[PDB]
């Protein structure tokens, strides 16, 4: 992303949807609901806040933090060794290696028994009050409001109390918008850019960066001259 | 305009004038709070338009905890409500209950099918909801037991009755009004000329039809009497 | 035109001579302010076109600070408010409130619904926001300290009620009129052969109409009396 | 660029807007909201003043100011070096390189632990007023006047009020001058073109710009004859 995520409030996108006078109707009830929609249905990875917690994990199980929405990765404490996946059907379950894990639901499933392991994750950032905080990007902001002034039009042409032609236009518009907001938080910025360069560019491949927290990813590969 | 000017247009229309006539302004308060609400379903019910301010009334609402269903202990948490009933709003406009300043609080009216399936997501839990059940009672319903300190909101909306949301109105700041003809009658003023059309030509054809005049035991309609 | 010509034109087409007649020029007067906004809303609510300068009427008004609910720290920053309550405008034209300088200023007139959330953005916090709550009053808001000093505005704009927004007009260069007569009707001199058309149809029907002439305990009117 | 960016203030995309009597319900306030929009919603870097903050790091974090909209660079203030980016899911926390950074609010999370950092951004240029300034581009001021008139047509189309031709002629006009408002601050000028000529044409290949603040990056290249 080229532009920093500046934090507003969600009543910010309510000064936006009530100039229009058929979203007068609108709520905060409702701008949090379309809110939560609208951030996973578009999945940028820059609109979550990357924590990291150690758990401890008591027989091949532990308990993940509340605000957890998705890790980035699990690793071992004392070692910094990161965990893959579990792909066993069997995990730690006895009959008569390289370490994993695995996450349902608050409880992560990992092949180790008694081990502290450092989990990295993204959460919501929140604000004084327990409520979404959204960046004031214009682009994520313009389509967040017709993201919401498309999903109250599509009830109200259920209802039919819009034009099939007005609907058609807001339908197009969200769909624009959708994809140079994906865009806008996607393509990399110069210092992003520079990392995915010395990534590319690797006379001896590096080829062991999950290992690590791919901390060596974007580092640049020096060759001695002889 | 208040009630008085909108029942003395369609009385003088009518030239009801006498003491001794057979439709009073009681005739005229009802069917004006009829065709009210006839005219605004007529004009803002099919495709959606701006509705203006005229058209809304705010309604002063006394709230006191109730339980859900009686004293006992494993039936749910127990609610809010409105110690008098509400009028039912019409479904054109922005209803809105807010805590006595209209710019200010999250409180929201929504249908009753609904507010039995409020709250579950953990962002939506702060948030007090407002239904009318079939009582006729305005609940209240929130996860956040601070909701249940509440005392007093008000409604803004559209009711369908514009006698009942007169009688519930906030007070002023001089004082209450005591009879319902010096109120503020609620209807835009572009919907005045065709809501007072269709009240006099209600009245109008039976304003000069027969009577049973005479006291003989016997109808005497038929005779046009 | 003033109020009285269009007044005298409706009396005179109905030829309403009389001081001992059913119909008077309050009658007139309630008629005229009733058919100016059915039809301004009739032309201009459709499709947007061009308003004249003539529907609309300048107000003035004073401001005084007002609580957000009461005098309690934790209820919210407080509000400027009209002492009076103003007209409610019509959403056809372009309502302008300006601090007693058309040309200048940015106090910007809004919906109710909007006017709790606003200001928000980091650039628009020194602007001051105006709406008609259902108190009845307008209100003013920015996150500016500033604006609590606002004592006075005029409020240019379409209002429903013309008759109200002639009792609260702007001083003029001689001084306040004392008749509602001798101030200017709103509306655009185009508008006016169909205003008079529909004011006298309303009123020639029940020109001629019967009257319950006698006292005699009794409804006279089936006997067209 | 080819021309030069002079400032003016937004009231000048009002003498425009409210030539057309549709458009007379117009404010200021609607003026800042679009601007905005607009402003972001094209991403030009010419658009935005070019700042260079100094700050301290105290432990892998730094306050960032307070008019930053995107990083152009961070580097280091004694040595100069520029910071890439943080890949590294695990950065500043323990177990039991080349510099980074990563900024997601006012927090810059770097790599460093007590330094001072040299940051490259760019904010927005204010008035007397703290309100934006647009460029006098009469083809900048004739889009973003497009732009406005395509956002409150739409509205008005929603409403009923607004022929189907007419918001299409909207649209239509809307879209070929965004594009020709792209390729006006995009395209070089002659004094851009000649340092791209210098990148371009190297016999040695310089493919370590981003250490430096791209400064030598047009820098012309030399061979010794022999």
Redesign the interface.
């Known amino acids: 992303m080229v532009n920093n995520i500046n934090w507003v409030k969600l009543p910010v996108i309510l000064d936006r949807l009530l100039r229009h006078p058929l979203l007068t109707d609108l709520n905060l009830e409702t701008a949090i609901q379309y809110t939560l929609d609208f951030i996973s249905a578009m999945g940028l990875p820059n609109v979550y806040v990357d924590k990291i917690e150690t758990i401890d994990i008591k027989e091949y199980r532990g308990e993940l933090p509340c605000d957890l929405i998705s890790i980035n990765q699990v690793r071992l404490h004392k070692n910094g060794i990161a965990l893959r996946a579990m792909t066993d059907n069997f995990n730690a379950y006895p009959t008569h290696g390289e370490p994993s894990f695995k996450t349902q639901g608050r409880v992560i499933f990992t092949s180790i028994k008694h081990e502290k392991v450092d989990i990295s994750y993204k959460a919501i950032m929140l604000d004084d009050e327990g409520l979404p905080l959204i960046p004031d990007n214009p682009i994520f902001l313009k389509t967040l409001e017709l993201y919401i002034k498309k999903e109250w039009f599509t009830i109200l042409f259920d209802m039919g109390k819009i034009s099939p032609a007005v609907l058609n236009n807001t339908q197009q518009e969200y769909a624009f918008k959708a994809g140079q907001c994906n865009n806008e938080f996607v393509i990399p910025s110069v210092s992003e850019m520079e990392a995915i360069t010395n990534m590319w560019n690797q006379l001896i491949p590096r080829v062991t960066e999950f290992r690590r927290g791919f901390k060596n990813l974007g580092d640049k590969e020096y060759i001695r001259v002889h | 305009?208040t009630y008085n000017?909108l029942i003395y247009?369609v009385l003088?229309?009518?030239?009801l004038?006498?003491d001794?006539?057979?439709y009073t302004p009681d005739h005229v308060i009802f069917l004006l709070v009829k065709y009210r609400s006839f005219l605004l379903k007529q004009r803002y019910s099919?495709?959606?338009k701006?509705i203006?301010?005229?058209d809304?009334?705010?309604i002063c609402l006394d709230l006191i905890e109730v339980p859900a269903i009686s004293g006992e202990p494993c039936e749910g948490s127990s609610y809010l409500r409105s110690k008098n009933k509400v009028p039912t709003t019409m479904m054109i406009?922005?209803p809105?209950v807010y805590?006595?300043?209209?710019?200010?609080g999250?409180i929201?009216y929504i249908s009753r099918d609904r507010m039995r399936y409020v709250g579950y997501?953990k962002?939506?839990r702060?948030?007090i909801y407002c239904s009318k059940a079939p009582d006729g009672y305005l609940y209240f319903k929130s996860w956040n037991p601070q909701f249940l300190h509440l005392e007093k909101v008000?409604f803004?909306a559209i009711f369908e009755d514009a006698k009942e949301a007169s009688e519930m109105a906030?007070p002023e700041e001089n004082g209450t009004i005591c009879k319902l003809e010096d109120k503020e009658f609620p209807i835009?003023?572009?919907?005045?000329?065709?809501l007072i059309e269709l009240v006099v030509k209600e009245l109008r054809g039976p304003?000069?039809?027969?009577?049973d005049e005479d006291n003989n035991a016997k109808d005497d309609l038929p005779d046009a009497r």
Chains 1, 4 share one sequence.
Do not use: H, W
């Not at chain 2, 003088?12 to 030239?15: G, I, N, Q, V, W």
């Not at chain 2, 835009?188 to 065709?194: H, K, R």
């Open positions: 305009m000017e247009m003088d229309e009518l030239k004038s006498s001794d006539s057979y099919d495709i959606k701006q203006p301010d005229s809304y009334q705010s406009g922005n809105r805590p006595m300043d209209f710019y200010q999250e929201t997501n962002f939506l702060n948030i008000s803004n906030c835009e003023d572009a919907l005045v000329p065709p304003e000069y039809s027969p009577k």
